[PDB]
Symmetry: C2
C-alpha cells in the first residue's frame, strides 16, 4: 500500500507541473533569454494556431496577432478572438500567460446593446 | 544566454512561476487526497486553510452548493467556480476557474430579455 506525492522528488515535481501546463485553460508561452519560444502549452498552441516552439516571439507577434482599435485591455488574434496577455520576467527568460476573453467581451456587448 | 530547459532545476523553477502567477486556481492532491500544494489563486478563491488538509474536509467548508449552480459550484463566500478534476500519477489535480463575472453578466442578460 504505497503512498505518493508530487513533492516526493524533483522528478515527480516536474511531472505534476507539466500536467498542469498541459491541461490549464490558459495559454503559456515560455521564452528563453533571447526571446525565442522554447515551450508552449496546448492552449497556447491552439489560440495562436502558428508554429511557436523555435520561433522568435517577435516573429510570432507579426503573424498571430491582429490588433483592432477596439481592443482595450486585450489584443485580437487572426481568428478574431480577443485575448489578455500577462507578461512576466523569468530567471531564464520570459513568461507569457494567454487567457481568452472573447466570450466575456461578447456578453458585455450584448448587455450594452440590449440596454437600447 | 539561458533557457528554462537548461536543467531539471531551471525547469521546475519556471513551472513554479507559472503556477504562482496563473489566473486559475491549482489544487494538488497526493494519493491519500491530502492537499500538498495550492497556488495563490486557489488560496484566494477558496480562502480557507488548504495545505496539509484532506480535500474532502476542505469541500465541507469552502463550498456551499446552490440549486442553480449548473456546470459550476458555489463557494461559501458567494463565488461561482468551475472545477476541472483530473487524475495524476501521484494523486489528483484540480483546476479552478472563476466564473462569477460570466455568470453575473449572463444573469443580467437573462433579466433584460424578460422586460
Amino acid at each position: 500500500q504505497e503512498q505518493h506525492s508530487h513533492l516526493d522528488s524533483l522528478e515527480d515535481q516536474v511531472e505534476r507541473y507539466k500536467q498542469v501546463l498541459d491541461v490549464m485553460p490558459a495559454g503559456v508561452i515560455l521564452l528563453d533569454t533571447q526571446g525565442i519560444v522554447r515551450e508552449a502549452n496546448p492552449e497556447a498552441q491552439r489560440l495562436l494556431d502558428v508554429p511557436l516552439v523555435g520561433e522568435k516571439w517577435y516573429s510570432v507577434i507579426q503573424i498571430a496577432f491582429a490588433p483592432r482599435d477596439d481592443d482595450g485591455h486585450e489584443i485580437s488574434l487572426r481568428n478574431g478572438r480577443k485575448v489578455r496577455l500577462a507578461i512576466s520576467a523569468s530567471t531564464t527568460g520570459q513568461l507569457i500567460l494567454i487567457t481568452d476573453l472573447t466570450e466575456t467581451r461578447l456578453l458585455q456587448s450584448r448587455i450594452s446593446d440590449l440596454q437600447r
